[PDB]
Ligand binder design. Structure first.
Ligand code: NI
Ligand code: NI
Lengths: 211, 211
């Protein structure tokens, strides 16, 4: 389904921290602007995407769920193809781009059993959706949900910190008040600008807003 | 490509010894007669099939080559899915029906390396095309090409045989003068009606024609 290829392309552009504009989508899929526009209209009617006022495509909860599953199948296919089949690594991504459309959930569950590790694709990116498969401003500690979000730093509050080893890590990552960074919760909290895994005191006292 | 699914269906019906009529094709693919007819017309223009005077579809050399490759990919997929992945055996055929369309030759070559044996599918049928992948009347000894063909028995010539252990095997298989049987050459010659692997004396003296 062309729908799956559009949703996965949006997913991938978002992971790369690129705004999912229609022209970006068109260019990545090697499809015309007008063709992309016609497909985006069908996808809005289907409830999978909305076109935001800055013209970027924002996937709905349903659109995002489907996108996520397509990416999971793509990445599990890449692991099968490299770890077990041994297809030349230069061909693995293009093979998996086809296989992601035809792999059942049942095969994915089997792949999770058989593969050594399903943490990441061979190309370094996390395999999403495995839980779904079945097996002032605000303080960063609070504002962080569990999926990555771009936010703006308002206070770092160095003056209140007892532990200071991360001051330089923040500097080396160019995180200052004003920096736009992506924040994430884990099984410990993390900032992206480089990746800084915050100890609790900092996570409790650094503040983030959003425009 | 719908073309691949039509050619593989023809292949499969032929293997089952069924005449590949358009209605049989329609029924197996769960497509309408008129839809099948429109696709067969495109396939004739493309040079992949001819419609014979008995209305059966006869694949051209090119059509047969493509059909063969689709079947090979289907069967290698089934071996991957059962031997390595362990997908529940009741789901393997339907999964492979999708995978046969997206598997590259390069993955098939890898599967030949990794799998224990690629003689047959899990469902008992030979994996064709591996050589292409890269790794009176006439006497039966002569008339047999290397691919199976339906022929008619004209003489068995029992009277000239020194070895007679196969007389009963032929009887048990219902091969008599008049029987329509499919003959095949191997790396030793064989008759099908049951399968009788002929010793040379019989293969040299049994005669076959065709209407
Ligand atoms: Ni990839
Ligand atoms: Ni099958």
């Amino acid at each position: 389904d062309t729908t799956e290829m559009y949703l996965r392309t949006i997913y991938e552009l978002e992971e790369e921290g690129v705004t999912p504009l229609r022209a970006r989508i068109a260019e990545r899929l090697e499809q015309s602007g007008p063709t992309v526009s016609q497909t985006v209209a069908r996808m809005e009617r289907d409830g999978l995407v909305v076109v935001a006022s800055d013209r970027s495509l924002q996937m709905t909860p349903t659109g995002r769920t489907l996108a996520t599953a397509v990416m999971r199948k793509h990445r599990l296919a890449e692991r099968l193809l490299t770890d077990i089949i041994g297809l030349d690594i230069n061909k693995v991504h293009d093979e998996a781009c086809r296989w992601e459309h035809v792999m059942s959930d049942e095969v994915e569950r089997r792949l999770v059993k058989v593969l050594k590790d399903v943490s990441r694709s061979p190309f370094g990116n996390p395999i999403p959706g495995l839980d779904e498969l079945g097996v002032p401003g605000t303080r960063v500690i609070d504002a962080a949900t569990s999926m990555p979000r771009k936010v703006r730093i308002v206070q770092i509050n160095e003056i209140f910190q007892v532990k200071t080893d991360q001051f330089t890590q923040l500097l080396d990552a160019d995180i200052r008040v004003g920096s736009e960074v992506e924040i994430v919760d884990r099984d410990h909290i993390t900032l992206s600008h480089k990746d800084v895994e915050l100890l609790d005191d900092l996570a409790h006292t650094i503040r983030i807003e959003e425009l």
